Amino acid sequence: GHMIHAISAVNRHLYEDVLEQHFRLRHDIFVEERHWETLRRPDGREVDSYDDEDTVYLLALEGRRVVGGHRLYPTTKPSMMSEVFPHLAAVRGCPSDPLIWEWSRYFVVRDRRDGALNLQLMAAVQEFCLDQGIAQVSAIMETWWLPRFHEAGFVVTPLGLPALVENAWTMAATVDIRRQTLDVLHDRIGMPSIVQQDGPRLDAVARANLC
Numbered sequence: 001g002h003m004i005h006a007i008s009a010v011n012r013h014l015y016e017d018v019l020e021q022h023f024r025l026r027h028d029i030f031v032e033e034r035h036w037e038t039l040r041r042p043d044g045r046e047v048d049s050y051d052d053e054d055t056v057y058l059l060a061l062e063g064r065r066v067v068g069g070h071r072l073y074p075t076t077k078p079s080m081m082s083e084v085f086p087h088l089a090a091v092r093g094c095p096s097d098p099l100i101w102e103w104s105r106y107f108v109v110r111d112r113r114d115g116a117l118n119l120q121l122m123a124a125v126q127e128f129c130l131d132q133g134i135a136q137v138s139a140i141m142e143t144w145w146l147p148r149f150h151e152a153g154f155v156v157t158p159l160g161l162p163a164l165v166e167n168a169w170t171m172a173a174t175v176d177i178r179r180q181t182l183d184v185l186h187d188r189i190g191m192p193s194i195v196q197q198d199g200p201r202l203d204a205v206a207r208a209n210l211c
């Protein structure tokens with residue numbers, strides 16, 4: 001029934017309503033709930049330097065209500081890791097590759113927490129990337145994400161030493177996109193497909209190469 005929608009420059013004309021709704025939800029969740037104060041904005045829209053023409057949003061929709069989601073950004077452009085947290089990837093280096101996209105802003109609205117949505121969101125990043133031929137995603141994450149990744153069968157490669165970011169233990173890592181990982185998650189969520197791609201086809205790897 002309800003699906004995760006892939007929204008990009010090529011199809012956002014079908015989702016302008018939904019995108020604005022998600023920017024406000026990101027403000028409710030990341031700013032007002034999680035107290036990530038560096039992201040507070042007076043328009044009540046949580047929008048940073050990595051929300052631009054090249055961002056891809058994977059948003060969980062129930063009708064037109066956004067109930068969860070995350071975003072992907074090409075590492076061929078300056079990224080959150082390269083610009084804000086390069087010290088977290090000092091051992092292995094910050095990713096920079098059309099085949100590696102930076103994954104951030106994972107959220108689930110309160111009404112949908114501790115339910116089916118979470119594992120669908122995990123499946124969605126794997127499904128979208130495999131479809132696009134993206135090999136890895138990169139992430140800056142709090143260390144409590146590690147068992148969550150492992151629980152979803154995500155293959156994780158740390159890029160550097162964990163460090164305190166504000167008052168929270170944080171690390172940089174890549175996640176390997178795997179058909180095998182996805183197949184198990186499809187079985188677990190009980191759906192052959194979780195990602196809906198309406199409007200024109202997106203060629204993410206090509207776009208990243210242009211950057």
Ligand SMILES: CSC[C@H]1O[C@@H](n2cnc3c(N)ncnc32)[C@H](O)[C@@H]1O
Nearest residue numbers: 036038039048049084140141142166
């Ligand atoms: C990504 S781990 C969470 C931490 O990263 C910070 N963060 C997330 N996005 C950005 C950004 N675009 N610029 C600076 N800090 C960020 C948040 O304020 C939080 O402290």
